[PDB]
């Protein structure tokens, strides 16, 4: 169909976060066999392989921001690949990896659809600047490069000269905030970005939150929706093998309801699955649950309803 027409982009990338091991994100998810789990239902599955990311040894850092240039080269390569696969009319499934990849993901998606919107599901806002950071890790700084309102507030980071800020403060909705920096919360209150922390989800319920989210983004104008997802926004009871484990996250049922409502919009146009670290699994059972969680999220993004799904023909024959 128009929905569940998939270009698969694997990015075995880790250089925007400290703990190496999310390079085996697409490796484990492909050996979890997301492709075959799509191929039952009417999915136009087409992988495009993994991207060859060069290793620049002289990736000289910024003041606090470390590894700018290899990350910028990675996201520029990924922006080309995402724009390429969205020329195909597919839905850009990109998965890594960490949030630094989402820069080029949203970039190449905005090259095709400049009118997009972002649902950034994450424990964090990841809205840090090079100035307002504490770690300098670019997986904590993807969003600030992509916001038009932080133009001039973004320093000239080596490797991100190609980056064009493509969305506005109204173009993005956060869901799942429970680990927010004072700089992050100050910027969030500064730009007036619509968000949904764990407080409002516990207040309204996940149905009312998803209702208000789709009313905010698609109630004005039906536009392509780029769900960019972090696994730590779900509770680490389900996803302990994530890079930034923060307790008190969303439930597995809640995330499945989110992705089912996104599929029932049908305006999903790009999916980003990051922070998948099998090396942070204390048991392989932890890895197994986390990977199955991410796969089931992706399947419910591409039509796997919990109520059941069938090919529209008679079965009583």
């Amino acid at each position, epitope marked *: 169909a128009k929905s569940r027409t998939i270009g698969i982009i694997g990015a075995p990338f880790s250089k925007g976060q400290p703990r190496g091991g999310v390079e085996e994100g697409p490796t484990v998810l492909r*050996k979890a066999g997301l492709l075959e*789990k799509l191929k039952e239902q009417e999915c136009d599955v087409k992988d495009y392989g993994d991207l060859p990311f060069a290793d620049i040894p002289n990736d000289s850092p910024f003041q606090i921001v470390k590894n700018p240039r290899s990350v910028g080269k990675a996201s520029e390569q990924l922006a080309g690949k995402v724009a390429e696969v969205k020329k195909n009319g597919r839905i850009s499934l990109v998965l890594g990896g960490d949030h630094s990849l989402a820069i080029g993901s949203i970039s190449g998606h905005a090259r095709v659809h400049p009118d997009l919107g972002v649902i950034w599901v994450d424990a964090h806002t990841d809205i840090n600047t090079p100035l307002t950071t504490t770690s300098g890790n670019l997986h904590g700084q993807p969003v600030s490069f992509l916001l038009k309102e932080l133009k001039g507030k973004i320093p000239d980071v080596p490797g991100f000269s190609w980056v064009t800020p493509c969305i506005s403060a109204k173009d993005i909705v956060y869901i799942g905030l429970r680990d927010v920096d004072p700089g992050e919360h100050y910027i969030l209150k500064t730009l007036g970005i619509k968000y949904f922390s764990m407080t409002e989800v516990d207040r309204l319920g996940i149905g009312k939150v998803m209702e208000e989210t789709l009313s905010y983004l698609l109630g004005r104008k039906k536009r392509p929706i780029h769900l960019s997802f972090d696994v730590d926004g779900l509770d680490p009871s389900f996803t302990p093998a994530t890079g930034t484990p923060v307790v008190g996250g969303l439930t597995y049922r809640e995330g499945l309801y989110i992705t089912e409502e996104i599929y029932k919009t049908g305006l999903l146009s790009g999916l980003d699955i990051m922070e998948v670290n099998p090396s942070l699994g204390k048991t392989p059972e932890e890895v197994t649950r986390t990977v199955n969680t991410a796969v089931a999220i992706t399947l419910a993004c591409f039509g796997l309803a919990r109520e059941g799904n069938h090919k529209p023909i008679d079965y009583l024959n």
Partner: antibody
Amino acid sequence: EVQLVQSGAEVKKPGASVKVSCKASGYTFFKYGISWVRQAPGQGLEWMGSISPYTGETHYAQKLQGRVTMTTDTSTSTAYMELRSLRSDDTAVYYCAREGAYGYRSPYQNWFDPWGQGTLVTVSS
Amino acid sequence: EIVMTQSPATLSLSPGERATLSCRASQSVSSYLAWYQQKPGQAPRLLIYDASNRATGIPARFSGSGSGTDFTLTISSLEPEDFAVYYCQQHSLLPRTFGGGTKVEIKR
């Protein structure tokens, strides 16, 4: 046919694992839970673990819980089983076979018929 | 951990009539176990899958009974290519105990 390509016969002294590719062929995956069974030569057989293919449910057997780790590779339907802190008790021909998944949509099997051909592992110093 | 006791330890039979074999369970398996054909130096092969019903290309002579403690395996029409170590093995209880070994010899 419904077949398993095991690979391959290998010994370790007391050391690291002998993770065996149990390459499935002929039959579809994610419907057919694959087990592993050791048998020392001149001895009876010992089932030692069986994953569900998708949503991997481990079900490791007694006396090695623990030392065993089993993984799935459903890109190309091979399966794997390691061992930790290998030992001279592990002089056994390791067979992988398929129980059949005890889910809801998986068809009924109880009887191990993909049969794998065996793998010579003697743990040896 | 239901102990599976095979009542013939070994067997020797110059090729001929019914060479029926036996396996007992420590509990009530209730027709939920299988029969196997571990040939020497070979991979085992399924003979009977659920206490009867003659799995998938077994020739003519390999019935069995049970239901549900002490099970039988009838080698009725011996056919001396069938000299192999045989195995009952419970399945519908974990962990999945095998039998003891049923080395079938020749009884010259």
